[PDB]
Amino acid sequence: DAHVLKSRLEPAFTILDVRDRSTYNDGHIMGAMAMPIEDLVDRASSSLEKSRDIYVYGAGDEQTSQAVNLLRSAGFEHVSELKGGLAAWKAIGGPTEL
Amino acid sequence: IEPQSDAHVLKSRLEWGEPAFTILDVRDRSTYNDGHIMGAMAMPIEDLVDRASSSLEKSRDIYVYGAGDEQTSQAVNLLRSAGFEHVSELKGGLAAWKAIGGPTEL
Amino acid sequence: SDAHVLKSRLEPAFTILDVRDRSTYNDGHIMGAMAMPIEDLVDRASSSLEKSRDIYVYGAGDEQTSQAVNLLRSAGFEHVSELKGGLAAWKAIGGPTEL
Amino acid sequence: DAHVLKSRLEWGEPAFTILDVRDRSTYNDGHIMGAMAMPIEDLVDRASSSLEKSRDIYVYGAGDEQTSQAVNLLRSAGFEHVSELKGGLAAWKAIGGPTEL
């Protein structure tokens, strides 16, 4: 129901997993979306607003920074890197799914 | 530690919760740009299945809304036939959402 | 399972107590809440919890909720808080539930 | 930073419950933080009456054999998610797991 949803929803944010889909399938940050870096710009730009709070993580920090930079170069105004990726996330007991 | 706690306070202390959810706006992008449900992602019906399949788990708790109950229902049918286990539509669409004071963006 | 996960999940500790009837609890309760119907609340809470544990309690209405809080406090429990509005208030703010 | 993000999530994993199956007096001298006293003797009845069969349960007793015994008593009762805390209290404190009394 809509009320149900309205309840769950500061501003909207989205978590992007830029690793390969297969890796995503083995496990990812809960709610994160699979957008392999190869098609990141196209998939991100076609589905989100440039003002969306976006949290990104790849297999390493270099891949994470490449992705973050790509998004910004594509007009995204609020992109942040998730240092440590999935590993650091799991270390603070962050929810994951597969 | 307050004799009477606010529901909001306890929710913030909780570590656990229900599954993540995703809101899909299946209208065209130009329409999406003029105004959509906050947090919703643009996945026009034309490439909905492909875009949904590549970015989400077939178990993702999905909520969809389109331009009219027929288009909303179409999105529901497309995803369920693609194997998505938890697809729900937003009855009334944007109107029902604005009616209940739902947050929107753009 | 590896405790690292659990340590990672884990402040200080707190427990949520649902004092309504067990059948009511089965139809839906705050996620993580434990079923301790008011009729045996004191005995169950006392045997499973320590008196210093932060406890959040909610019942079906104002009377049952306040009664529960009073039973625990007069039983020696030090940190009991009335979860204002109980389940209904919780649902109203999109709070997680289980059945 | 994973913390600001983790703080903003409107979702998460299921609830978990830690059960200390040693006797109550032992529990009183120290137990895992948030854990609860459900001695072996009343484990099944106490757990069944206060928790849902689907609760993600973590158990620890005095020695791996008592722990494993507790886990099987719960599973045989229909509990769907029960895990042993191998090495018990020692292993828990070993990794810095919080405790209380």
Structure, described:
The structure is a homotetramer. With 98 residues, chain A is of the alpha/beta class. Chain A has a single domain, classed as Oxidized Rhodanese, domain 1. Helices cover 42% and strands 19% of the residues of chain A. The first copy, chain A, has 5 helices and 6 strands, in the order αβαββαβαβαβ. The first copy, chain A, has helices at 2-8, 21-26, 40-47, 61-73, 85-91; strands at 13-17, 28-29, 33-34, 53-57, 79-81, 96-97. In chain A, strands 3-1-4-5 form a 4-stranded parallel sheet, with helices on one face. A two-stranded antiparallel sheet of chain A has the order 2-6. The first copy, chain A, is globular and about 40 Å long. The interface between C and D is medium-sized, with 29 and 37 residues. Strand 1 of chain B pairs parallel with strand 5 of chain C, so a sheet runs across the interface. The PDB classes it as structural genomics, unknown function. Keywords: ALR3790, rhodanese-like, NSR437C, nesg, structural genomics., PSI-2, Protein Structure Initiative, Northeast Structural Genomics Consortium, structural genomics, unknown function. The assembly is tetrameric. The entry is titled "X-ray structure of the Rhodanese-like domain of the Alr3790 protein from Anabaena sp. Northeast Structural Genomics Consortium Target NsR437c". Chains A, B, C, D: Alr3790 protein.
